[PDB]
Symmetry: C5
């Protein structure tokens, strides 16, 4: 298996790593039909989503983003799909 | 996808955004059948979460409200269906 | 729909509001068969249960709520309870 | 329904109350096949398990409760345990 | 049943116990297809994963619980005492964790 988020991210097409090193600025979530999604932003002007639906991992990701937001946990890197707008989170690291 | 709560909210009929910028004043939860969640703010607003991709999102929104309440997190905006009393929560943003 | 716990409570029978305005004193839970239940107490001498069981998920949520309220010493405002059970059975909770 | 952990525990065969009044010393959790279990220890020398399931939701809830009690250093009042297992197997927990 | 993580670990092939006694340095999780996994590291250079579910049917719940545990451990800076890991995987795969 990959040893870290950068190696993991590299195994996928249409991805990149954002090095953030900052807490989440805003956290948004929606239960509205066909838009069951989460959005986060950062002070650097980045906006990322967790896309509407593996199914278990998407739910876990939204759980992680929420508690990271509320606890002001520093996000190190995000691996994101850059063929979606907002870019879609594939992986997160916290250090 | 929508980049923020205001864009998301616009995609539905009978929705509106409320700008709150305040912590939740009260959190009410009911298991009595026919299963309410209710929040209030000091500005005098009352919202509910009404009882599938959507079923899991509904359960998540209730989790988010309880933890926002307990952590005293500032709620930025809510997207609500205004054809229900209290108004019914579609999305939340926290900043 | 109801807009507060007091309004909500009065839409059911065999209920009343306890106005607690206090943290939970103790929290008890059991996985023993037929007694899959939670019990809370307060300083004022009151003992309440979450009865052994969608509505299913509401009951699990209630127990999650009481555990976290207990652990964080969150002030409980009111409980709507069924008073035809012993201990009285929690229908709803408000925290303010 | 029982009004506290002791009454509850008394309804079952092969159980006992351990009165601990202390935080959990160690928390151990396993995903290994056939050993999907939790173990807790106390400073007084006691070791307890949550048995691998063989009630399902309540068993998962109990593991959640033990983990958060441990991390928050929550004082465990009493444990109702089955004593025909080694380690004794947790049926119920009270915190105060 | 085993009474501790070492006894437990000794019942399995291809495992060892790492005695860590330290909080988690980094926590990583991915939802990317066939890489639904968590990775943790420690200051001493250890890297461990919770493997993608591949496992029986009761293990699935326990895999999900482990990832929950590692996330909250990391966020609360809980000292991890020992890990029982399969060492025929890289990163080594977590079978059990003890916290003290
Ligand atoms: C939080 C917020 O207000 N977001 C809105 C904003 O987001 C974009 C802007 O912040 C611009 C400013 O340059 O950057 C876009 O991202 C670029 C990215 O730029 C670099 O990273 C960002 C985070 C900043 O650090 C920039 O200064 C950097 O140069 C490039 O590296 C990348 O190649 O291209 C993207 C654009 O495709 C911001 O876009 C948002 O965030 C990124 C990461 C993507 O997820 C993108 O899809 C997002 O839209 O303005 C946009 C409108 O363009 C929206 O209104 C956001 O709400
Ligand atoms: C917390 C509380 O006391 N709630 C009870 C209260 O709630 C209503 C009042 O607060 C009135 C005062 O005029 O406003 C209602 O909301 C209006 C809304 O007004 C605007 O937003 C509110 C929150 C205040 O800040 C006002 O000053 C604002 O002008 C209008 O913008 C909107 O078009 O219409 C609604 C009414 O539907 C409050 O109603 C509650 O909150 C809103 C957001 C809805 O969800 C609604 O369904 C709620 O009832 O009084 C009512 C009965 O009058 C109940 O007792 C509430 O529990
Ligand atoms: C925490 C504890 O040890 N509880 C045990 C105890 O609880 C009962 C006592 O606390 C008595 C003392 O009067 O009150 C019972 O409650 C009454 C209630 O009284 C009001 O609330 C209590 C908590 C006090 O604050 C009083 O001053 C109040 O007036 C009445 O209003 C109500 O009509 O009747 C109940 C009794 O049926 C306590 O009973 C427990 O808690 C109440 C809220 C119910 O849920 C009831 O079912 C509970 O048993 O004593 C009992 C045995 O009598 C148990 O051992 C409790 O565990
Ligand atoms: C934490 C630890 O190191 N645990 C290992 C240990 O646990 C046993 C010892 O702690 C002995 C020491 O006397 O007591 C056992 O428990 C007894 C119990 O004794 C009393 O209660 C305990 C908690 C202590 O306070 C003692 O001082 C008391 O005398 C009796 O009440 C009971 O009737 O019998 C049990 C034994 O079954 C400890 O056993 C463990 O904990 C108990 C509560 C059970 O769950 C039991 O199954 C456990 O084994 O030693 C054992 C092997 O002997 C393991 O190595 C533990 O890891
Ligand atoms: C945190 C980090 O940056 N990790 C990257 C790193 O990890 C390996 C190194 O840290 C070396 C140091 O020699 O040890 C590897 O583990 C060995 C293990 O060595 C002993 O334990 C570690 C924790 C150190 O304390 C060493 O000093 C010890 O000698 C041996 O006992 C074992 O037989 O072999 C393993 C693997 O070579 C680290 O590997 C990672 O951690 C271990 C526990 C396993 O889970 C392993 O599979 C992991 O890869 O370097 C690797 C590339 O080699 C990656 O870049 C890591 O991200």
């Amino acid at each position: 298996a990959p040893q870290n988020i950068t190696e993991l991210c590299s195994e996928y097409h249409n991805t990149q790593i954002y090095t953030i090193n900052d807490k989440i600025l805003s956290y948004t979530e929606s239960l509205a039909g066909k838009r069951e999604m989460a959005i986060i932003t950062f002070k650097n002007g980045a906006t990322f989503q967790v896309e509407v639906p593996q199914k278990k991992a998407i739910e876990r990701m939204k759980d992680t983003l929420r508690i990271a937001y509320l606890t002001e946990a520093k996000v190190e890197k995000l691996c994101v799909w850059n063929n979606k707008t907002p870019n879609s989170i594939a992986a997160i690291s916290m250090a």
